[PDB]
Amino acid sequence: MWKVGFFKRNR
Amino acid sequence: KLLITIHDRKEFAKFEEERARAKWD
């Protein structure tokens, strides 16, 4: 997607 | 782009659903 790549694990 | 509010709650429950779940589950 956008930041999700490392965000859906980060957030 | 706001799926990272509820879907992220599952994208984290990889082992968390067996670590912080089995506790009360």
Closest-CA residue in chain B for A1? Answer: B1
Amino acid making up residue B6: I
Cβ–Cβ below 8 Å for A11 and B12: yes
User: Are A8 and B4 contacting, i.e. CB atoms less than 8 angstroms apart?
Assistant: yes
Tell me how the structure was determined.
NMR
The residues, any chain, with a CB within 8 Å of residue A1's CB and separated by 6 or more, are B1
User: How many A-B residue pairs are in contact by the CB < 8 A criterion?
Assistant: 16
Q: What share of chain B is helix, strand, coil (3-state, %, to 5)?
A: 40, 0, 60
Cβ–Cβ below 8 Å for B1 and A11: no
Distances (CA, A) of B10 to A8, B4: 9, 10
Chain B residues contacting A via beta carbons under 8 Å: 1, 3-4, 7-8, 11-12
DSSP state of B19: H
